[PDB]
Design an enzyme around this catalytic site. Structure first.
Site, PDB file in Angstrom:
ATOM      1  N   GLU A   1     -42.726 -28.858 -53.237  1.00  0.00           N
ATOM      2  CA  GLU A   1     -41.552 -29.354 -53.976  1.00  0.00           C
ATOM      3  C   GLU A   1     -40.638 -30.225 -53.127  1.00  0.00           C
ATOM      4  OE1 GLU A   1     -39.966 -25.904 -56.833  1.00  0.00           O
ATOM      5  OE2 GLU A   1     -38.610 -27.634 -56.765  1.00  0.00           O
TER       6      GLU A   1
ATOM      7  N   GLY B   1     -38.968 -34.737 -25.139  1.00  0.00           N
ATOM      8  CA  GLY B   1     -39.766 -34.005 -24.159  1.00  0.00           C
ATOM      9  C   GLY B   1     -41.231 -34.391 -24.221  1.00  0.00           C
TER      10      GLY B   1
ATOM     11  N   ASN C   1     -29.083 -35.536 -31.928  1.00  0.00           N
ATOM     12  CA  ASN C   1     -28.176 -34.794 -31.041  1.00  0.00           C
ATOM     13  C   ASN C   1     -26.808 -35.453 -30.867  1.00  0.00           C
ATOM     14  OD1 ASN C   1     -29.555 -32.438 -30.393  1.00  0.00           O
ATOM     15  ND2 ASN C   1     -30.282 -33.149 -28.403  1.00  0.00           N
TER      16      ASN C   1
HETATM   17  N1  LIG Z   1     -30.466 -29.766 -29.895  1.00  0.00           N
HETATM   18  C1  LIG Z   1     -31.170 -29.382 -28.808  1.00  0.00           C
HETATM   19  N2  LIG Z   1     -31.788 -30.341 -28.075  1.00  0.00           N
HETATM   20  C2  LIG Z   1     -32.517 -30.003 -26.983  1.00  0.00           C
HETATM   21  C3  LIG Z   1     -32.625 -28.599 -26.571  1.00  0.00           C
HETATM   22  N3  LIG Z   1     -33.385 -28.576 -25.466  1.00  0.00           N
HETATM   23  C4  LIG Z   1     -33.733 -29.866 -25.202  1.00  0.00           C
HETATM   24  N4  LIG Z   1     -33.196 -30.704 -26.098  1.00  0.00           N
HETATM   25  C5  LIG Z   1     -33.352 -32.167 -26.199  1.00  0.00           C
HETATM   26  O1  LIG Z   1     -34.753 -32.422 -26.295  1.00  0.00           O
HETATM   27  C6  LIG Z   1     -35.095 -33.481 -25.405  1.00  0.00           C
HETATM   28  C7  LIG Z   1     -35.829 -32.892 -24.209  1.00  0.00           C
HETATM   29  O2  LIG Z   1     -36.964 -32.201 -24.694  1.00  0.00           O
HETATM   30  P1  LIG Z   1     -37.365 -30.708 -24.274  1.00  0.00           P
HETATM   31  O3  LIG Z   1     -37.687 -29.958 -25.548  1.00  0.00           O
HETATM   32  O4  LIG Z   1     -36.394 -30.092 -23.292  1.00  0.00           O
HETATM   33  O5  LIG Z   1     -38.747 -31.028 -23.498  1.00  0.00           O
HETATM   34  P2  LIG Z   1     -40.096 -30.177 -23.689  1.00  0.00           P
HETATM   35  O6  LIG Z   1     -40.614 -30.358 -25.091  1.00  0.00           O
HETATM   36  O7  LIG Z   1     -39.785 -28.804 -23.167  1.00  0.00           O
HETATM   37  O8  LIG Z   1     -41.152 -30.995 -22.774  1.00  0.00           O
HETATM   38  P3  LIG Z   1     -41.415 -30.854 -21.177  1.00  0.00           P
HETATM   39  O9  LIG Z   1     -40.290 -30.048 -20.586  1.00  0.00           O
HETATM   40  O10 LIG Z   1     -41.469 -32.316 -20.799  1.00  0.00           O
HETATM   41  O11 LIG Z   1     -42.729 -30.143 -21.111  1.00  0.00           O
HETATM   42  C8  LIG Z   1     -33.785 -34.143 -25.021  1.00  0.00           C
HETATM   43  O12 LIG Z   1     -33.415 -35.132 -25.993  1.00  0.00           O
HETATM   44  C9  LIG Z   1     -32.826 -32.974 -25.031  1.00  0.00           C
HETATM   45  O13 LIG Z   1     -31.477 -33.381 -25.238  1.00  0.00           O
HETATM   46  C10 LIG Z   1     -31.919 -27.614 -27.417  1.00  0.00           C
HETATM   47  O14 LIG Z   1     -31.959 -26.391 -27.144  1.00  0.00           O
HETATM   48  N5  LIG Z   1     -31.234 -28.072 -28.479  1.00  0.00           N
END
Ligand SMILES: Nc1nc2c(ncn2[C@@H]2O[C@H](COP(=O)(O)OP(=O)(O)OP(=O)(O)O)[C@@H](O)[C@H]2O)c(=O)[nH]1
Ligand SMILES: CC[C@H](C)[C@H](NC(=O)[C@H]1CCCCN1C)C(=O)N(CCCCC(C)C)[C@H](C[C@@H](O)c1nc(C(=O)N[C@@H](Cc2ccc(F)cc2)C[C@H](C)C(=O)O)cs1)C(C)C
Ligand SMILES: Nc1ncnc2c1ncn2[C@@H]1O[C@H](COP(=O)(O)OP(=O)(O)CP(=O)(O)O)[C@@H](O)[C@H]1O
Ligand SMILES: Nc1nc2c(ncn2[C@@H]2O[C@H](COP(=O)(O)OP(=O)(O)O)[C@@H](O)[C@H]2O)c(=O)[nH]1
Ligand SMILES: [Ca+2]
Ligand SMILES: [Mg+2]
Ligand SMILES: [Mg+2]
Lengths: 338, 428, 53, 437
Positions: free
Chosen positions: D254, D143, D206
């Site tokens: 640690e 993200g 993931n």
């Molecule tokens: N394991 C897991 N992965 C997530 C989740 N939400 C998003 N992702 C992963 O995180 C990445 C996307 O990032 P997000 O955290 O949705 O984006 P953000 O940090 O909100 O950033 P913007 O929306 O661009 O402002 C991708 O690889 C998704 O598959 C979650 O709840 N669990």
């Protein structure tokens, strides 16, 4: 439709595999950098194993075992043999060998060497060949790269007519399930100029490659004797067979070497699969005792046999994993109870 | 609320725009008076993307209806969903533009454009967090092509940091016989290359051929064409209108679909293709939707996808189906046909699933592709353009509104550059 | 082979087991970097409005 | 007792955050009210659980947590969901418009305008701490907010709290649940900028979690709910030592001491077993030998890679449930003779071991079965560099064509930050190879 990628152009063996796969009409070739392949015919050096098995909806298979370099480098083989309880250190079928770095087991080498002096026994070693330690130590220190001092076999088995040396090449295929498959056809790569005990300088009677042999081809076609003829020589000349006198020892050595590394290299519980074709190089002394010289991780076949072996590689290695729309291999397995 | 401001310009623009609002109002349970009468809270979660909310629990489209003649907008006002639109958002002249881009862009359209912008300003100021703008128009006429691109340019000046989205209908000699449409289209494409973030290339050639060949309509009407346009428009905006993961706003769509700024022209697809009334009683399986949405015969741009490579793709499935099976089928398409997806953008196909299907269907799929094959559409316009322009044919209709030939040369150049740019990435 | 550092308690216990033995930017610099980006960003936007003018 | 502040950045960070505090509240006997009947010192204390939870005069137990996202949607679900009364409104920080899967937009454009507010809110938690040891930062690599804002925050936290430790739980991008094609860019950018400022980072691919959910939990097509409840278990095993009485990994320093000899090579591999479907009707309970042997299977790791073809520099085993040291040592002896476990020559071949007698808590009506004993192995191995190679490859493919680069340059970032970020990763891959062969 399955898909593959070719990443070693120099491989005579896997050029024939790709040709044979395309001819089936159920395998399409992609370009090297396309990741969406079922099969990688990989590069010799720096093969990117870390990138395999991370493409969803594709079962991926590679033609090398990561870590198999331990068997297929001379200094790695000595160390593997010397440090694994399943082989070491009283391994009867690998010549007494020592890893020697230029300017280590040189102090340990000289110790066993100087008892062969006072013991008054044949003290010739290989790196190349000499009976004095000074020539070999001073040769490598000069040379450049890391090398092995290995015991030279003074008393090789000699073919007649001609009083010549030879070595045996056996091609071995290890599939994704770690079934060990020895190809029934092997080959003897012969010297064509008589073996000389006293004369070590001239290194053509002593070194039985296919290239360094360049008379040449006096006795057999391209200095390659095959197993039907060699079986017949053993029956006529020595009243024995290839199977009994030599091929059991070869089977034992191959299976011992490959079972020793199975825990390190197996792809059984992995996210990509491996197979690999090895070429084992064997020496036979005058007592019909077989000795392992080396293992080659990227062998070439002999001209006569290419068509059969490569079809075998497709049948047992590739079509086992990727099925389509009389066996050339002997499967090496032994489970003795104790 | 991430609000989108919709503008529709000219006959085609107002006609496909009107139909868009009919379709999405029905999908969100809004009726012609603006009252909600739906049976699902998923319909209202992101309603503010396209609808303002007035007192009396009334939903009004955030829609501005523009034209230089009154005919098409009287047709819209008098139509079934016509009473839904805000009355002050109908902005129209009397002159018309005579299928002339110069009249729309420089003379007749100049006189009206500041009253359009006053309505755009009013709608924009009312937004908590404006995403940007979507325009429906044709490129072959005068008002939608000429005045529409003038509007894009003015909106960009006031709102330089918002997303500009178009549904641009491309002219075909199978649908229109106005000789100067390649002129209007080439001038309009020059504008779209510079001033839009995302353009959906709805090609009348493709729409006609689908209706004739596939749908077996021997005398297609504009209505038959527009039924395919509205399906596509419903489809490609699904991710913007319902929750909520992939391409959920215009900027996120653009960052996924546009690897280079100028190459922002998309090739939409749809399955199943249907004609009005004639009933789909049999729902498609997940494997058929996936085969059909990638089929050449289902593209709304008349381009052969096998003649190029996909830079980026968005696939959006609608209805209740197995997500596992969608994932298998999508992977299957890109693994069986891997050489049409550029190796140098890994994982360039993204997939969404929405649970609510469109009206009259249980299962649908909508394809959005940024393919290098789209050069064939621009190349077709360029050839039609050069044939006339090398003899300066019909140019007096444009120079009589004050244009110079140099504008034509520049527009010709920029589009030929676009074509060679697409060929550049097709051979990397 | 060898257990060491054994600590016990009511919740659990921990230890170590040996098999074999051996053989920042300043607050200013962050702001100069964030402001330079904003200035480049604003230059690009001003050039756009120059062109549209 | 020394306090730890958890920071959750972006959707992934926030949502993994929810699953974690849910799980902690269950483990510690805290209700969604914030009320802990078992806690007898009302209005304060310095128990081990007070590392993660502060206390009010009314007997409410409040996470030492800040949730930050540049977009209201997902933090609004935290504000209105089961655990709404657990968190003070000033802990939940939201922007208006997000970073559009763009590192540069999260770091430079929207980061600049929100950074000082986030630090103010973190400063309000540090002020009610007697002895702050540092931070646990949850975020995605992919993200814009997760990549870009986190890296900025980490640079700030270094300035404002130089002596404090910072741990990461980072989500490594996988195409099976990714929402953007530019996640490789975002990942290398944030890894480059955050590398100096993070003492220890736990990467969770993931892809690995998604497969574990299909293979072992029998889930057709995993959602973030499925993935996060597994992630939270792994996170809980890791943080249990800070929240419970014990003598292994009792403080953040640690983790670094025990797992990170080389400061740059600070990415330990997490492996977890057993993972058992709740719906599974009959299950043979796995022994200490079996769950410990499962820690050396690639299929159970948070990042798919092969430790056989690398070297270990450190290795912790963290058990939960019915486990005694006799069984652990017997298991190690057996395992050592059957498997390839090379340590680097300058570390002892050995295992730091921690046992908590309470078995793993499961969320009621979750996918995971109750078990008598579980283990998380934390091993710093060079094999995890496979994850950098994969990511660096995808980066190179796109960057050679300058694909999508204009989106980053548009936000103020220079094309040179890409190649800097990249060649830092080149050197990191080269560090791992130097240590590993
Ligand atoms: N394991 C897991 N992965 C997530 C989740 N939400 C998003 N992702 C992963 O995180 C990445 C996307 O990032 P997000 O955290 O949705 O984006 P953000 O940090 O909100 O950033 P913007 O929306 O661009 O402002 C991708 O690889 C998704 O598959 C979650 O709840 N669990
Ligand atoms: C006799 C001319 C016919 C009408 C014309 N054929 C051509 O132009 C041929 C002739 C020679 C060489 C090739 N060209 C293309 C034709 O069939 N047209 C387009 C040209 C109309 C331009 C002028 C004559 C008005 C078709 C469209 C035409 O049949 C019309 N459809 C409609 C139509 O869709 N009306 C709807 C309302 C509507 C009005 C105006 C609109 F712009 C859109 C919708 C209501 C109907 C009931 C419906 O929904 O089907 C009005 S006119 C194209 C699809 C090829
Ligand atoms: N200990 C030993 N005793 C007798 N002969 C030996 C020997 N070591 C090597 N040789 C001879 O040297 C030849 C080649 O040896 P080796 O296989 O080690 O070199 P190489 O690896 O460069 C050739 P290739 O890799 O193609 O098989 C053999 O054919 C054999 O005759
Ligand atoms: N698909 C479609 N195309 C249309 C429609 N109306 C006009 N066109 C096309 O648009 C072009 C003329 O543009 P038009 O919108 O009528 O001119 P304007 O009123 O000046 O914008 C021609 O190529 C027509 O075929 C319509 O309702 N649907
Ligand atoms: Ca207390
Ligand atoms: Mg008209
Ligand atoms: Mg977000």
């Amino acid at each position: 439709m399955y898909t593959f990628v070719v990443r070693d152009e120099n491989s005579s063996v896997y050029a024939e595999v790709s040709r044979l796969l395309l001819a089936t009409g159920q395998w399409k070739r992609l370009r090297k950098d396309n990741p969406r392949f079922n099969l990688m015919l990989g590069e010799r050096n720096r093969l990117p194993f870390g990138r395999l098995g991370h493409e969803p909806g594709l079962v991926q298979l590679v033609n090398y075992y990561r870590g198999a370099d331990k068997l297929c480098r001379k200094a790695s083989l000595v160390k593997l043999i010397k440090t694994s309880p399943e082989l070491s250190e009283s391994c009867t079928w690998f010549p007494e060998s020592y890893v020697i770095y230029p300017t280590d087991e040189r102090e340990v080498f000289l110790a066993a060497y100087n008892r062969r002096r006072e013991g008054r026994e044949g003290n010739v070693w290989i790196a190349l060949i000499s009976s004095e330690a000074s020539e070999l130590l001073d040769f490598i220190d000069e040379q450049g790269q890391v090398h092995v001092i290995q015991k030279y076999l003074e008393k090789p088995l000699l073919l007649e007519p001609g009083h010549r040396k030879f070595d045996i090449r056996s091609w071995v295929l290890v599939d994704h399930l770690y079934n060990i498959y020895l190809y029934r056809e092997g080959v003897l790569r012969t010297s064509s100029e008589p073996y000389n005990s006293a004369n070590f300088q001239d290194k053509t009677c002593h070194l039985t490659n296919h290239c360094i042999q360049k008379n040449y081809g006096r006795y057999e076609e391209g200095n390659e004797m095959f197993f039907e003829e060699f079986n017949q020589y053993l029956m006529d000349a020595l009243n024995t067979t290839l199977e009994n006198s030599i091929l059991l020892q070869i089977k034992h050595i191959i299976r011992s070497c490959l079972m020793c590394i199975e825990p390190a290299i197996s792809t059984k519980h992995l996210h990509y699969q491996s197979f690999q074709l090895f070429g084992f190089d064997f020496m036979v002394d005058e007592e019909l005792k077989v000795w392992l010289i080396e293992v080659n991780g990227a062998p070439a076949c002999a001209q006569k046999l290419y068509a059969e072996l490569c079809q075998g590689i497709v049948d047992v290695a590739i079509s086992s994993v990727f099925p389509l729309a009389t066996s050339i291999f002997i499967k090496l397995h032994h489970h003795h109870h104790h | 609320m991430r609000e989108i401001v919709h503008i529709q310009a000219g006959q085609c623009g107002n006609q496909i725009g009107a139909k868009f609002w009919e379709v999405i109002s029905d999908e969100h349970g809004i009726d012609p008076t603006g009252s909600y009468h739906g049976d699902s809270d998923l319909q209202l979660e992101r309603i503010n993307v396209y609808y303002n909310e007035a007192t009396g629990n009334k939903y009004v489209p955030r829609a501005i209806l523009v034209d230089l003649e009154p005919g098409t907008m009287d047709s819209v006002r008098s139509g079934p969903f016509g009473q839904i639109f805000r009355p002050d958002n109908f902005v129209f002249g009397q002159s018309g533009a005579g299928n002339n881009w110069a009249k729309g862009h420089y003379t007749e359209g100049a006189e009206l454009v500041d009253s359009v912008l006053d309505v755009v300003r009013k709608e924009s100021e009312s937004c908590d967090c404006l995403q940007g703008f979507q325009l429906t128009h044709s490129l072959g006429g005068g008002t939608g092509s000429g005045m529409g691109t003038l509007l894009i340019s003015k909106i960009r000046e006031e709102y330089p940091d918002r997303i500009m989205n178009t549904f641009s209908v491309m002219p075909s000699p199978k649908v229109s016989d106005t000789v100067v449409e390649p002129y209007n289209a080439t001038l309009s494409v020059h504008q779209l290359v510079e001033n839009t973030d995302e353009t959906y290339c709805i090609d009348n050639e493709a729409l006609y051929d689908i209706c004739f060949r596939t749908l077996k309509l021997t005398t297609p009407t504009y209505g038959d064409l527009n039924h395919l346009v509205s399906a596509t428009m419903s489809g490609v905006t699904t991710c913007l209108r319902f929750p909520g993961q992939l391409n959920a706003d215009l900027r996120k769509l653009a960052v996924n679909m546009v690897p280079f700024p100028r190459l922002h022209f998309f090739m939409p697809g749809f399955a199943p293709l249907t004609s009005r009334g004639s009933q789909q009683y049999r729902a498609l399986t997940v494997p058929e939707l996936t085969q059909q949405m990638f089929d050449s015969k289902n593209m709304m741009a008349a381009c052969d996808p096998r003649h190029g490579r996909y830079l980026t793709v968005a696939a959006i499935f609608r209805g209740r189906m197995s997500m596992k099976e969608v994932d298998e089928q999508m992977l299957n398409v890109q693994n069986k046909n891997s050489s049409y997806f550029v190796e140098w953008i890994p994982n360039n196909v993204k997939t969404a699933v929405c649970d609510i299907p469109p009206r009259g269907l249980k299962m649908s799929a909508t394809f959005i592709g940024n393919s290098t094959a789209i050069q064939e559409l621009f190349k077709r316009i360029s050839e039609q353009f050069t044939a006339m322009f090398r003899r300066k044919a019909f140019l007096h209709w444009y120079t009589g509104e004050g244009m110079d030939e140099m504008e034509f040369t520049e527009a010709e150049s920029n589009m030929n550059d676009l074509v060679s740019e697409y060929q550049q990435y097709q051979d990397a | 082979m060898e257990v060491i550092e054994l600590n016990k308690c009511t919740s659990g216990q921990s230890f170590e087991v040996i098999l074999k033995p051996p053989s920042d930017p300043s607050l200013e610099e962050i702001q100069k970097k964030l402001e330079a980006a904003e200035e480049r960003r604003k230059y690009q936007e001003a050039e756009l409005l120059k062109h549209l003018a | 007792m020394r306090e730890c502040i958890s920071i959750h950045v972006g959707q992934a960070g926030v949502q993994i955050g929810n699953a974690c505090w849910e799980l902690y509240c269950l483990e510690h006997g805290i209700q969604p009210d914030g009320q802990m009947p078992s806690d007898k010192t009302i209005g304060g204390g310095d128990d081990s659980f007070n590392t993660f939870f502060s206390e009010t005069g009314a007997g409410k137990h409040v996470p030492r947590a800040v949730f930050v996202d540049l977009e209201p949607t997902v933090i609004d679900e935290v504000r209105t969901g089961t655990y709404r009364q657990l968190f003070h409104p000033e802990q939940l920080i939201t922007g208006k418009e997000d970073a559009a899967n763009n590192y540069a937009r999260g770091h430079y454009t929207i980061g600049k305008e929100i950074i000082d507010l986030v630090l103010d809110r973190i400063r309000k938690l540090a002020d009610q701490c007697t002895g702050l040891q540092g931070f646990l930062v949850f975020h995605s690599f992919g993200g814009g907010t997760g990549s870009g804002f986190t890296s900025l925050l980490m640079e700030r936290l270094s300035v404002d709290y130089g002596k404090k430790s910072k741990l990461e739980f980072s989500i490594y991008p996988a195409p099976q649940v990714s929402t953007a094609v530019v996640e490789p860019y975002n990942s290398i950018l944030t890894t480059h900028t955050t590398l100096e400022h993070s003492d220890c980072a736990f990467m969770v691919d993931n892809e690995a979690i998604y497969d574990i959910c299909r293979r072992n939990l029998d889930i057709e097509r995993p959602t973030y709910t499925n993935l996060n409840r597994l992630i939270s278990q792994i996170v809980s095993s890791i943080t249990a030592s800070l929240r419970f009485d014990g003598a292994l990994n009792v403080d953040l320093t640690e983790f670094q001491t025990n797992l990170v000899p080389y400061p740059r090579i600070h990415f330990p591999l997490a492996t977890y077993a057993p993972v058992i479907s709740a719906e599974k009707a009959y299950h043979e309970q796995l022994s200490v030998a079996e769950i410990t042997n499962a820690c050396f299977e690639p299929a159970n790791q948070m990042v798919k890679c092969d430790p056989r073809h690398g070297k270990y520099m450190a290795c912790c085993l963290l058990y939960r449930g019915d486990v005694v040291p006799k069984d652990v040592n017997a298991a190690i002896a057996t395992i050592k003779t059957k498997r390839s476990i090379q340590f680097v020559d300058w570390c002892p071949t050995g295992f730091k071991v921690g046992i908590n007698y309470q078995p793993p808590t499961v969320v009621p009506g979750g996918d995971l079965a109750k078990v008598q004993r579980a283990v998380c192995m934390l091993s710093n191995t060079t094999a995890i560099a496979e994850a950098w190679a994969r990511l660096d490859h995808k980066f190179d493919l796109m960057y050679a064509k300058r694909a999508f680069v204009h989106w980053y340059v548009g936000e103020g970032m220079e094309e040179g930050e890409f190649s800097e970020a990249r060649e830092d990763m080149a050197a990191l891959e080269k560090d791992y190879e130097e240590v590993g062969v």
